[PDB]
């Protein structure tokens, strides 16, 4: 019968590893780098677009940074199509919680459920896992500002600063070097850009090859604002820190 053509996506190696999960992580390591840095007064999300063409429409484009609700956003590394499947599920899950409890969903609860979906694809159903790693940046009134990451295994962890995708090893060393706890948002903006500028596989970091976003309490009194940076705003912030 059809047994002949079954890859058996949800089995263990003799060493106790999940073949498909390991190989999905290998795929992700070639995707454009994405960085998250958590400051005391906000969070920065920075990501490098995958080798751009000059005829790409840059302003009406979204590849790396996606909005989940008004208080939570994600940076993507991996297959974009796979990520959008998961993003729409996460968006719906957030609305279910709001409908049920009349309160915005706590960040960890959303992250756990999305990670639980990834886990299922590695234990049952005979399907390939999602080739995606997320950086979650969000705020709630329990833990304040939070950074998380999840990967195809469905395992998630919390961070002060973290990178996913390409050159994470080099990027993590640089973040570990210059990060300190009393850091502000504007300092974190600079650290995020400086790190990408040194770890990039490109010749020079320009406005057209970046996506940027901040989550501050820099609205008016006790409320959180999401700023997905426009092209010209990335051009200005790149000049303001003296990278171009």
């Amino acid at each position: 019968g059809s047994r002949r053509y079954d890859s058996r996506t949800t089995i263990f190696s003799p060493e106790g590893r999940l073949y498909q999960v390991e190989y999905a992580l290998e795929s992700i390591s070639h995707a454009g780098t994405a960085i998250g840095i958590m400051a005391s007064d906000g969070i920065v999300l920075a990501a490098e677009r995958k080798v751009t063409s000059t005829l790409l429409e840059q302003d009406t484009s979204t590849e790396k940074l996606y909005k989940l609700n008004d208080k939570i956003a994600v940076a993507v590394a991996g297959l974009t199509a796979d990520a959008e499947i998961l993003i729409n599920t996460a968006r719906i899950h957030a609305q279910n919680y709001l409908k049920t409890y009349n309160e915005d969903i706590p960040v960890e609860i959303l992250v756990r459920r999305l990670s639980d979906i990834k886990q299922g694809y590695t234990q049952h159903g005979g399907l390939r896992p999602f080739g995606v790693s997320f950086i979650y940046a969000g705020y709630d009134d329990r833990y304040g500002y939070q950074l998380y990451t999840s990967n195809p295994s469905g395992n998630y962890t919390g961070w002060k600063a973290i990178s996913v995708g390409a050159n994470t090893s080099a990027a993590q060393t640089l973040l570990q070097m210059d990060y300190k706890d009393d850091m502000k948002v504007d300092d974190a903006i600079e650290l995020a850009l400086k790190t990408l500028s040194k770890t990039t596989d490109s010749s020079a970091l320009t406005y057209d090859r970046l996506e940027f976003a901040t989550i501050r309490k820099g609205a008016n009194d006790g409320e959180v604002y999401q700023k997905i940076f426009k092209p010209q705003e990335i051009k200005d912030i790149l000049v303001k820190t003296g990278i171009t």
Binding site: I11, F12, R17, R112, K118, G126, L127, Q146, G158, W159
Partner: protein, 240 residues
């Protein structure tokens, strides 16, 4: 529905998928359980290749199943959430129908049964997780510590460890634990647990987690400084 029989017998009578799940447990961070005269202590290793962590929000290694029972594990972290969730739901369901919280033996028997089901069901792989389940039965002061593994077998232990280098710490416990006289106090039990982890860990800094469970839903997690005092005290007695 995906039907494939993934866990099957081999010519020598082994179920390799169950045995390979045990290798995933062997890769996981070390976990240890030690029960005293009036308490149980659960100790857990945390690897230090991860700096820049946020420990406020990162999932803790020891999980409360109910107010009187806790569960720690070794193996795949994602897999453990599924077992913990099912255990927490069964805990509330038992309170609802029997009008009494679960015994530690019952909660363990349930978790072990779930693990076994995943070894002879089509389309699923076994859990890459072994658990230590500890606590006190309702209106009882006798300490309880149980262990489960991917195959589904479970048993009670005076003290036990699982995870990477668990054979080294089990060796330590086998000569340092007297059945005739278990650690009489909380301090004694925590110390023997910290000692056993120090045989394997590295630095006694932000690498060791300790959770103490006492009778009648009395569970608390120690902080860095509190654990660091045990580390400091043990090293000074060692230089002799």
């Amino acid at each position: 529905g995906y039907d494939r029989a993934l866990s099957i017998f081999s010519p020598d009578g082994h179920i390799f998928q169950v045995e390979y799940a045990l290798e995933a447990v062997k890769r996981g961070t070390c976990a240890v359980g030690v029960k005293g005269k009036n308490c149980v202590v659960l100790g857990c290793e945390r690897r230090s290749t991860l700096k820049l962590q946020d420990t406020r929000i990162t999932p803790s290694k020891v999980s409360k199943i109910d107010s009187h029972v806790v569960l720690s594990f070794s193996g795949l972290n994602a897999d453990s959430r599924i077992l913990i969730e099912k255990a927490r739901v069964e805990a509330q369901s038992h309170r609802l129908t029997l009008e009494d919280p679960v015994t530690v033996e019952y909660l363990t028997r349930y978790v072990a049964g779930v693990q076994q089901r995943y070894t002879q069901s089509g389309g699923v792989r076994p859990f890459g997780v072994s658990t230590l389940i500890a606590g006190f039965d309702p209106r009882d002061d006798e300490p309880k510590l149980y262990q489960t593994e991917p195959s589904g077998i479970y048993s009670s232990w005076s003290a036990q460890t699982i995870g990477r280098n668990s054979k080294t710490v089990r060796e330590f416990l086998e000569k340092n634990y007297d059945r005739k006289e278990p650690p009489a106090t909380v301090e004694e039990c925590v110390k023997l647990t910290v000692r056993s982890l120090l045989e394997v860990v590295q630095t006694g800094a932000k690498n060791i987690e300790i959770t103490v469970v006492k009778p009648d839903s009395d569970i608390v997690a120690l902080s860095s400084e509190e654990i660091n005092q045990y580390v400091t005290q043990i090293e000074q007695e060692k230089q002799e």
